[PDB]
Chain A
Amino acid sequence: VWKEATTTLFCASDAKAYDTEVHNVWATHACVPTDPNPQEVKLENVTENFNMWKNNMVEQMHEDIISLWDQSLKPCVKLTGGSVITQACPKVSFEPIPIHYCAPAGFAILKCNDKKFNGTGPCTNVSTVQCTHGIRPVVSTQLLLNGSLAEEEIVIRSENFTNNAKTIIVQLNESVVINCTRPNNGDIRQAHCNLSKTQWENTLEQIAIKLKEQFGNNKTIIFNPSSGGDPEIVTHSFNCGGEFFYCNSTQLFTWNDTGRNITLPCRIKQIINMWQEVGKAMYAPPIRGQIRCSSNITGLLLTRDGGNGTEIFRPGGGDMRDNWRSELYKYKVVKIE
Chain B
Amino acid sequence: XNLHFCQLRCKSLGLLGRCAXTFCACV
Docked pose: A275 CA to B20 CA in angstroms? 10
Does A243 sit at the interface, judged by CB under 8 A?
A: no
Does A228 sit at the interface, judged by CB under 8 A?
A: yes
Chain A residue numbers with a CB within 8 Å of B18 are 165
- In the complex, are the beta carbons of B26 and A275 less than 8 A apart? no
B15 vs chain A, min Cβ distance (A):
6
> How many inter-chain residue pairs (CB < 8 Å) link A and B?
56
Complex interface bits, B6-27 against A, C-beta within 8 A gives 1, otherwise 0: 1001100101011111111111
Q: What is the interface of chain A mostly: helix, strand, loop, or mixed?
A: loop
Docked pose: A275 CA to B23 CA in angstroms? 7
Which bracket fits the contact residues of B? 10 to 19
B4 vs chain A, min Cβ distance (A):
12
- In the complex, are the beta carbons of A318 and B15 less than 8 A apart? no
- In the complex, are the beta carbons of A278 and B2 less than 8 A apart? yes
Does A316 sit at the interface, judged by CB under 8 A?
A: yes
Q: Which of A45-53, A143-151, A229-237, A244-252 contacts B (4 or more CB under 8 A)?
A: A229-237
Does A277 sit at the interface, judged by CB under 8 A?
A: yes
Out of A227, A279, A321, name the residue touching B26 (CB < 8 Å): A227
Chain A residue numbers with a CB within 8 Å of B2 are 278
Does A319 sit at the interface, judged by CB under 8 A?
A: yes
A323 vs chain B, min Cβ distance (A):
10
Docked pose: A279 CA to B22 CA in angstroms? 8
- In the complex, are the beta carbons of B25 and A316 less than 8 A apart? yes
Out of B9, B22, B27, name the residue touching A273 (CB < 8 Å): B22
Does A320 sit at the interface, judged by CB under 8 A?
A: yes
- In the complex, are the beta carbons of B24 and A275 less than 8 A apart? no
A192 vs chain B, min Cβ distance (A):
24
- In the complex, are the beta carbons of B26 and A229 less than 8 A apart? yes
Out of A227, A229, A303, A305, name the residue touching B23 (CB < 8 Å): A229
Chain B residue numbers with a CB within 8 Å of A227 are 13, 15, 25-27
Does A276 sit at the interface, judged by CB under 8 A?
A: yes
Assuming the contacts A227-B27, A228-B26, A229-B26, asked whether A318 and B6 have C-beta atoms less than 8 A apart, the reply is no
- In the complex, are the beta carbons of A233 and B27 less than 8 A apart? no
Docked pose: A321 CA to B22 CA in angstroms? 11
Does A274 sit at the interface, judged by CB under 8 A?
A: yes
Nearest chain B residue, comparing its CB with the CB of A305: B27
Chain A residue numbers with a CB within 8 Å of B13 are 227-228
Docked pose: A317 CA to B24 CA in angstroms? 11
Chain A residue numbers with a CB within 8 Å of B24 are 229-230, 233
Docked pose: A276 CA to B23 CA in angstroms? 10
- In the complex, are the beta carbons of A229 and B25 less than 8 A apart? yes
Chain A residue numbers with a CB within 8 Å of B26 are 226-229
Nearest chain B residue, comparing its CB with the CB of A317: B20
A300 vs chain B, min Cβ distance (A):
15
Out of A165, A274, A303, name the residue touching B22 (CB < 8 Å): A274
- In the complex, are the beta carbons of B10 and A233 less than 8 A apart? no
